[PDB]
Write a protein that binds this ligand. Structure first.
Ligand SMILES: *[C@@H]1O[C@H](CO[C@@H]2O[C@@H](C)[C@@H](O)[C@@H](O)[C@@H]2O)[C@@H](O[C@@H]2O[C@H](CO)[C@@H](O[C@@H]3O[C@H](CO)[C@@H](O)[C@H](O)[C@@H]3O)[C@H](O)[C@H]2NC(C)=O)[C@H](O)[C@H]1NC(C)=O
Ligand SMILES: *[C@@H]1O[C@H](CO[C@@H]2O[C@@H](C)[C@@H](O)[C@@H](O)[C@@H]2O)[C@@H](O[C@@H]2O[C@H](CO)[C@@H](O[C@@H]3O[C@H](CO)[C@@H](O)[C@H](O)[C@@H]3O)[C@H](O)[C@H]2NC(C)=O)[C@H](O)[C@H]1NC(C)=O
Ligand code: NAG
Lengths: 162, 108
């Protein structure tokens, strides 16, 4: 990469209809407390209601943006209802090129770091002056930060213990 | 709508789906709120579903058109079933392929 810069695109405090501080697990511990991935937010229902999210973001920067989001595949309908209220849910993401509509996927799964739920992450490059439009009524792991990139060339990943 | 390849060579058939902007546009264009396209060949087993998101305008349009293809062998039939959002074929293409090359990029 020729330039890389972490920037805030959806501030954590701008989620006034949902709960952004309960999206936490002991699979991602930090200082003896439970925590999570710092650059995305695990949104959870507020007073037994997950109102449909509609959140747009316009790339008012001069270079490309790497944006990351995710979905939560829960364990059962009982866990779905507990976390997001709405039984049947979706995440749509829309760019000038992207046309995506994710659906949570209930199966029953072996525990990995205590968890049988799964987190599935997705990315895209957001061109200068394009906008990305999220719509979700549940299970949405929303971005807080994204990354500015300019790419002038390529290499590979090296594996080394040095 | 079924079609039988009564020709002697393979057929390249193309169809598509319309991913609209909102439920309000879905209803306006195709009435039925929840829709699908199924396509069936001796090999093909496909069931498409329109995909509502909200999208940046490209040539004025926020809707998207997603196209699909297949080769239809001689004496096979292709069976379409759709209650909405279907971009149906009118023409298809006869092909015989005896070899391969690539696409060249040239301004000449
Ligand atoms: C992403 O945002 C850019 C810039 O948006 C502009 O600044 C923001 C801070 C907000 O104040 C926006 O409301 C504001 O539009 C969008 O590009 C801009 O689009 C507007 C029209 O929507 C352009 O204005 C036009 O100006 C010409 C003359 O210059 C007039 O003829 C038109 O009638 C119209 O007023 C504006 O020039 C343009 N700016 C740039 C730098 O491109 C951008 O469209 C938006 N994302 C998407 C998906 O559209
Ligand atoms: C695609 O269509 C071909 C040809 O279809 C035939 O001609 C069309 C213009 C229509 O009139 C069709 O109704 C007509 O069948 C199908 O192949 C044909 O299948 C039929 C049986 O469905 C064959 O008839 C058989 O003939 C033998 C003896 O020759 C008898 O033992 C059988 O009882 C039966 O009558 C016919 O021979 C065959 N023709 C050719 C050239 O293959 C084809 O099946 C169809 N597509 C699919 C998916 O089946
Ligand atoms: C939660 O929602 C209920 C029913 O809609 C409402 O009566 C109550 O006031 C809400 N909670 C708080 C803390 O206001």
């Amino acid at each position: 990469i020729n330039h890389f810069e972490k920037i805030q695109i959806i501030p954590k405090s701008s989620w006034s209809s949902h709960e952004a501080s309960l999206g936490v697990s002991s699979a991602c511990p930090y200082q003896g407390k439970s925590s999570f991935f710092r650059n995305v937010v695990w949104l959870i229902k507020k007073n037994s209601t997950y109102p449909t999210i509609k959140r747009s973001y316009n790339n008012t920067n001069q270079e490309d943006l790497l944006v990351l989001w995710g979905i939560h595949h829960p364990n059962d309908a009982a866990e779905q209802t507990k976390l997001y209220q709405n039984p049947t849910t979706y995440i749509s993401v829309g760019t000038s090129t992207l046309n995506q509509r994710l659906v949570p996927r209930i199966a029953t799964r072996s525990k990995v770091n205590g968890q049988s739920g799964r987190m599935e992450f997705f990315w895209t490059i957001l061109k200068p002056n394009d906008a990305i439009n999220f719509e979700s009524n549940g299970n949405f792991i929303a971005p807080e930060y994204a990354y500015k990139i300019v790419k002038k060339g390529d290499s590979t990943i090296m594996k080394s213990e040095l």
